[PDB]
């Protein structure tokens, strides 16, 4: 499976956007969390289907598939959020009809911090002019790199996606040194995504304990991350 075919396969596997609408009135702490969690819940279902379309993912052991998904889900959700927001500075496009202003992050205690590192990272991806194909590779890499016989099969799958990303950057036409530098600049941002995910999951868990918003079923299983 050549790099182009892998990239092409990821492009097709892109899940359609989940449509959710902003509540009628100005957000309240409860209505914002209900919105964010309802969207996350529905996107998680599609994320599972997306993952199965990633070459070799279904060939890993069920337990590994689970561990990988329990470990990266929020990062994947956020990587998708930043991409949708790439062409809208100061804005977070959670959904077509759910465009949040940084200032709206004031109604939920502690989420404003989250919105900021997301906006900051987005600005960075904007600075670098992240491309669609690049984005596809990176999101897949996040899933396969969340390693937080298949283990060997996993490494091979990550190198396949890495090769694809390398291939995409090469097609841009920049010098060989600049390709290396771009590959580096793009990947140095994964640490930021991982950190944002951590704050996000700590935050959501807190909102749940606070009874600020209900969290149950699939969203919950992912949150607890212990179905195994």
């Amino acid at each position: 499976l050549s790099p182009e075919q892998l990239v092409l396969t990821l492009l097709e596997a892109e899940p359609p956007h989940v449509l959710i609408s902003r509540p009628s009135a100005p957000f309240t702490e409860a209505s914002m969390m209900m919105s964010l969690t309802k969207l996350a819940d529905k996107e998680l279902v599609h994320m599972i289907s997306w993952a199965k379309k990633i070459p070799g993912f279904v060939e890993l052991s069920l337990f590994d598939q689970v561990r990988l998904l329990e470990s990266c889900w929020m990062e994947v959700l956020m990587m998708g959020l930043m991409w949708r927001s790439i062409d809208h500075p100061g804005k977070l496009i959670f959904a077509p009809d759910l465009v949040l202003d940084r200032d709206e992050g004031k109604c939920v205690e502690g989420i404003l911090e989250i919105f900021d590192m997301l906006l900051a990272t987005t600005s960075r991806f904007r600075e670098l002019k992240l491309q669609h194909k690049e984005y596809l590779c990176v999101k897949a890499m996040i899933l396969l790199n969340s390693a937080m016989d298949s283990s060997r099969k996993l490494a091979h799958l990550l190198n396949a996606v890495t090769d694809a990303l390398v291939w995409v950057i090469a097609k841009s036409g920049i010098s060989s040194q600049q390709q290396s530098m771009r590959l580096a600049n793009l990947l140095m941002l994964l640490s930021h995504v991982r950190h944002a995910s951590n704050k996000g999951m700590e935050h959501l868990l807190n909102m749940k304990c606070k009874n600020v918003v209900p969290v149950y079923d699939l969203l919950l299983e992912m949150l607890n991350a212990h179905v195994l």
Partner: peptide, 13 residues
Amino acid sequence: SGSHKLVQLLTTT
């Protein structure tokens, strides 16, 4: 708990 909904979506659908 430990088999149901993540696991269901992964192997059932």
